[PDB]
Amino acid sequence: CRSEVLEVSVEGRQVEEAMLAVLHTVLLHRSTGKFHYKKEGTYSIGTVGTQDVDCDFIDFTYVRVSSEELDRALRKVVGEFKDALRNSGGDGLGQMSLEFYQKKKSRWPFSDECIPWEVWTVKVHVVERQICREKVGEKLCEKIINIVEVMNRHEYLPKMPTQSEVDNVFDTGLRDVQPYLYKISFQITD
Amino acid sequence: LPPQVHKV
Amino acid sequence: LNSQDRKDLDKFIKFFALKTVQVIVQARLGEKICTRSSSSPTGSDWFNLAIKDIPEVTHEAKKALAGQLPAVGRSMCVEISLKTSEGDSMELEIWCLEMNEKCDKEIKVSYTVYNRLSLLLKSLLAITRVTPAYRLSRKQGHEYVILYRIYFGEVQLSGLGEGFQTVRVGTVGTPVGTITLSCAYRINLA
């Protein structure tokens, strides 16, 4: 299972916006329109919209899928990341990771096996404020370019599912966009 | 017009 | 080398090229782009992405193509330029949609080429926001504007200045060739 590592040095005020830029760009690639099945292996696809997001603390814009439900969810975990950082009081060392997985169905009494096929890890070093607003923007420009280059290496995507498999591949709970099953967690290494 | 349906 | 697969691949490529122009030009208009997601299959949203077509751009893009598709020696190029109120012009970007002779024998045009082009379009959206000309385009309208041109033929890279950078947006393999999408952009903004 392939793993990609990003590192970034930001000011404390820039931590939340830098993590959403990365997570949203990844998820922009790792989602599709909502599937609506007609037969077992026949379905049609909805339409993904996008939003430009100007950052308030970084001189930077990124594209995200237009879904308040998905954006609210990413903001929740990123905020916990920031709470843990602010409460850590260390050198400012921490990381978030985003993992896409499929499910193999299990028989009673065990839970389905979760088989990750891609994990994205973002390491942060929290560290005048004027020049940082631009330097971090330029660095973020690098990461998005880096993320796009990884994307199109075409390493492996799950087989497109029948109606019976669709919940072992995709997160079908959101109202307007359909992401690959994913989990976000974080660690504080200060 | 795009593909209307996708078959698996 | 099947027939129904050929007519579908040509339609996929043609519409991919048309949407590529729209995405690039809309990224240089000076306005944030915010489109809607819909669960319901709209039936007309190419590559399942909410890309509202500007008619003028579609006309300008068809006139450059003239019923033809990219191929070896025939690449589609979107040139992005800055024009000052005093008449000075500076070239900023050359986006090139090329196709080479390298074939992918075992690749399904029915949905696998389609879904990879859809992914490439998404990479295009992200990348257009992080190249140096995006900020310039958002600030346009008073001392300068951003103009565009669509060539179809040999790729010519003059005018970006010494030290210009090239980013590959991504590639799609097909039974008749490999589509490549990239951007060469000026970094010496003089």
Numbering used by the authors:
A (entry chain C): 3 to 129, 136 to 198
B (entry chain F): 832 to 839
C (entry chain D): 5 to 194
Article sentences:
We designed a fusion construct between the HDIR and ATG101, using a flexible linker of five residues (GSDEA) to increase the affinity of the ternary complex for crystallization. We determined the crystal structure of the ATG9A HDIR-ATG101 fusion construct bound to ATG13HORMA to 2.4-Å resolution. The asymmetric unit contains two ATG9A HDIR:ATG13HORMA:ATG101 complexes, both in a similar conformation, except that the ATG101 WF finger is in different conformations in the two complexes due to differences in the crystal packing environment. Our ternary crystal structure of the ATG9A HDIR:ATG13HORMA:ATG101 complex determined that the HDIR binds at the interface between ATG13 and ATG101 HORMA domains. We term the interacting portion of the extreme carboxyl-terminal part of the ATG9A tail the “HORMA dimer–interacting region” (HDIR). This structure shows that the HDIR binds to the HORMA domain of ATG101 by β sheet complementation such that the ATG9A tail resides in a deep cleft at the ATG13:ATG101 interface. The HDIR peptide binds across both HORMA domains within a long hydrophobic groove. ATG101 β2′ (Y45) and ATG13 αA (K15, F16, K18, and F19), αA-B connector (W50), and αC (Y115 and Y118) form a hydrophobic patch of residues, which support the full length of the HDIR. The loop between β2′ and αB in ATG13HORMA (T46-W50) is positioned to support the binding of the HDIR. This rearrangement supports a hydrogen bonding interaction between ATG9A L832 and Q835 and ATG13 K15 and G47. The loop region of G43-Y45 in ATG101 joins a β sheet network between β2 and HDIR residues H837-V839. The interaction between the ATG9A HDIR and ATG13:ATG101 is distal to and thus apparently independent of the safety belt region.
ATG9A is the only known ubiquitously expressed transmembrane protein of the autophagy initiation cascade in mammals. The TMD of ATG9A forms an interlocked trimer and functions as a lipid scramblase. The ATG13 and ATG101 subunits of the ULK1 complex form a heteromeric dimer through homologous Hop1/Rev7/Mad2 (HORMA) domains. ATG9A, ATG13, and ATG101 form a multifunctional hub at an early stage of starvation-induced autophagy and mitophagy initiation.
